Design a protein around this ligand. Structure first.
Ligand code: ANP
Ligand code: ANP
Ligand code: ZN
Ligand code: ZN
Lengths: 280, 276
């Protein structure tokens, strides 16, 4: 008069009426709020307007290291991203968090009396975005014959409740981190195509902006760069020469114009010699 | 080449102060745990086991709900890791009432709420495994197919407590029968099938189990009470937290009214003698 269940079916039902093992894997990671410098036309970056996000986003980061790299105004520390709301950051990926040295703050305190650290961070990220916009124009217009594209990492603003502070965050690059040119206007002698293109990019920024801006301190791993110095070639104000906090050498633009050596890429881009006259 | 004013303007704008107003995130991040199955496509022959790795989900509060032993609030899931929950979908989050936690405070030394939630979710999975079997064995002459919603375990630090979460159903929410055996009078085929289902569970399990408190929208159900019809004590009578009267079984057998579906399923009279 029926077709009732079997042993297996009965076992699986009765087992649910009992306590079943539940071992929640321990909670590791530090909660943070991420802010992004948005773009009006991400597809045409060089014609897009930048504006800071309003509503913060949740993310979790694993502070897996105490190793603070660098000797400049900031120190970089690697962290891991467990998760990020809307995946603004990549889960299970290493990132670098950068903060300034108290000294540096104290110095800018006399300019940024309030929320010094946050302001310096806002400027650092805006500075990198400026470099990105110039590279976007560069890759877009550069001759097809050129095989390399300088690329700057995206940098986000991060606020750590636990650490009670703001940081700039970007993907951690694995590889030989090197410098093509520096804050003194000096450059390396190229050994290959990649390096020739990096060096030519700096020359190109000066020409392209009709002499108003010079991007120096090109550095990173391969084509992927970070932390450049976008210099307002003619400014004279104390701390208004570089988009972001940087220590410029003795008359860096002068040195650059005098020491830069054009290469096969510079000529491929039709750039004129820096040593020429400004007016004549 | 061409270095426009718009291009120059947007570059130079980055050298100056651009307004920044840090606004705290909206909603709250929560940790979700799932009661996994070894054989989803064959749920009634599958083993249930709790997941270990809790995944994040982002929820935003919308409104509210109360019934007997729980408080419920409707929320929006805007994003979640590996889509453990569906982004852009509505969910209902439920937490136990004071009295209920105070009733199991002795039964469950520590993590009372955690266990209450675990048992509640397990109870619904049991009913689900039964609806699965039902849909497999029922005659093709029976159209509709009852189904229980999957319930997930949730942890929220904002509130510092555990909850159960499930998809929010849209439509008129109604109860077909309850824990004391009362039944609505079926006004359509679907309600008949629902009423026939509770009877089917009893017969299918050889009088060992009975699913009451059928409720939901259309053929989608939630919040059932799975009763071990042979226990002589309420304390060990229901799978998860549930309001039952020791008269439940007897009452259901006495009150239940078989319908065309019950007959379609060839179900015997619940009033009959059990040793005959
Ligand atoms: N994206 C990255 N990936 C891997 N390593 C990095 C990355 N960025 C920086 N680093 C390393 O950490 C150090 C600190 O970087 P950074 O803060 O940019 O120093 P800096 O160039 O001296 N600038 P500053 O701090 O403004 O004076 C670098 O010299 C690298 O060795
Ligand atoms: N999945 C759902 N979708 C839409 N509404 C729901 C859902 N679940 C519950 N509700 C509503 O909220 C009320 C209370 O349900 P709930 O929070 O699940 O617990 P409850 O009060 O413990 N139920 P019960 O055990 O049957 O007495 C219901 O009567 C419905 O109106
Ligand atoms: Zn050159
Ligand atoms: Zn019946």
């Amino acid at each position: 008069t029926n077709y009732y269940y079997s042993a297996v079916e009965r076992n699986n039902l009765m087992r649910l009426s009992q306590s079943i093992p539940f071992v929640p894997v321990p909670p590791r990671g530090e909660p943070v709020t991420v802010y992004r410098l948005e773009e009006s036309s991400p597809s045409i970056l060089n014609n897009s307007m930048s504006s800071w996000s309003q509503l913060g986003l949740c993310a979790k980061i694993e502070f897996l290291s105490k190793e603070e790299m660098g000797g400049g105004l900031r120190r970089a520390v690697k962290v891991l991203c467990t998760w990020s709301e809307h995946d603004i950051l990549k889960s299970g990926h290493l990132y670098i968090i950068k903060s300034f040295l108290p000294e540096v703050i104290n110095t800018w305190s006399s300019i940024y009396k309030e929320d010094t650290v946050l302001h310096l961070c806002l400027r650092e990220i805006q500075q990198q975005r400026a470099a990105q916009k110039l590279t976007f124009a560069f890759n877009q217009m550069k001759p097809k014959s050129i095989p390399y594209s300088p690329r700057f990492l995206e940098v986000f603003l991060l606020y750590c409740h636990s650490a009670g502070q703001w940081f700039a965050v970007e993907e951690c690059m694995t590889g030989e981190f090197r410098k093509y040119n520096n804050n003194n206007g000096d450059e390396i002698i190229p050994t290959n195509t990649l390096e020739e293109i990096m060096l030519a990019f700096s020359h190109w920024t000066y020409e392209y902006t009709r002499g108003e801006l010079l991007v120096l301190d090109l550095q990173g791993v391969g084509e992927n760069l970070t932390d450049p110095s976008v210099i307002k070639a003619e400014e004279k104000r104390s701390c208004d020469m570089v988009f972001g906090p940087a220590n410029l050498g003795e008359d860096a633009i002068k040195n650059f114009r005098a020491k830069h050596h054009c290469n096969s890429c510079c000529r491929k881009l039709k750039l004129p010699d820096l040593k020429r006259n400004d007016y004549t």
